[PDB]
């Protein structure tokens, strides 16, 4: 009736459905599409579908997806602090996790259904994007631990590479992913 998930129909539905995609209008208000709320949404088919992922897309897909989930959880858990005080005043590592969460929200969770290429995303393409994002996060963590500034990381040329990664066609994606992995490795090797 008003988005109240306690009414009898919602309770009866959620007792049997294998997944719940709690669609939210706040994200679409912020021009975030497909405006799916990662909080309060769940799926029970990840476990039985893990072997299919391992056989069909990559052996390391479930671990990478769990890494994405953990980063999203950390970003959500830091929201009260980043709301009480602005991200600029926030600590360096916390600022890093906030920025990587934004990177995820803008380059992986986002999807332009009106596009000629990005409207559909294969599992392998998503795996490549997630692997690139985790490589960026690990490299940024290593760089911060050795004394680099956050804004230095915030302006590397590999960021726009990951941004444009999702707009490549399916057949162009493998080489693009490999070259972007090489670019991120070499770039973060260059940073002190």
């Amino acid at each position: 009736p008003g988005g109240d998930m306690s009414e009898p129909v919602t309770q009866s539905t959620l007792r049997i459905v294998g997944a719940f995609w709690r669609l939210d209008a706040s994200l679409a208000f912020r021009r975030h599409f497909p405006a799916i709320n990662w909080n309060g949404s769940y799926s029970l088919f990840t476990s039985a579908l893990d072997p299919w992922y391992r056989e069909n897309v990559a052996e390391d897909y479930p671990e990478l997806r769990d890494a994405i989930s953990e980063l999203l959880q950390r970003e959500a858990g830091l929201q009260e602090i980043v709301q009480l005080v602005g991200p600029d005043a926030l600590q360096d590592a916390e600022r890093l996790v906030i920025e990587v969460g934004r990177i995820i929200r803008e380059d992986f969770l986002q999807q332009n259904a009106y596009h000629e290429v990005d409207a559909y995303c294969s599992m392998k393409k998503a795996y490549g994007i997630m692997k690139m994002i985790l490589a960026f996060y690990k490299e940024a963590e290593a760089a911060i631990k050795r004394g680099v500034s956050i804004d230095e990381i915030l302006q590397l040329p590999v960021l726009e590479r990951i941004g444009r990664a999702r707009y490549v066609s399916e057949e162009e994606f493998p080489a693009y992913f490999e070259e972007a992995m090489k670019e991120i490795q070499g770039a973060f090797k260059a940073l002190a």
């Binding site: 602090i81 009480l84 005080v85 005043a89 926030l90 600590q91 360096d92």
Partner: protein, 104 residues
Amino acid sequence: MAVIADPETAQGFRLAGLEGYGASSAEEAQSLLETLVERGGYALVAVDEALLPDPERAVERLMRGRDLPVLLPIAGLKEAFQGHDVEGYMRELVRKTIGFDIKL
């Protein structure tokens, strides 16, 4: 006002006509500071950091509802010549007053 620090610092503040007390141990300084607060004539008491790092443990016993004799810690001259930890002091202050260690 008044300054409660080592006798050298107290004499130097007396050079300005300000009340000074020379104390080398924390308990003696706190005991005499209680008497000074009971006197209450002066509007400010400055205490050495090396003598009473946290004068908040002793301010609240008296002047419970009144805060006219406001007090703050100051670095003693012996370590003031060496140097003062301003940024760590501000960080511990913001921790004591907010509690999130949010800096830089």
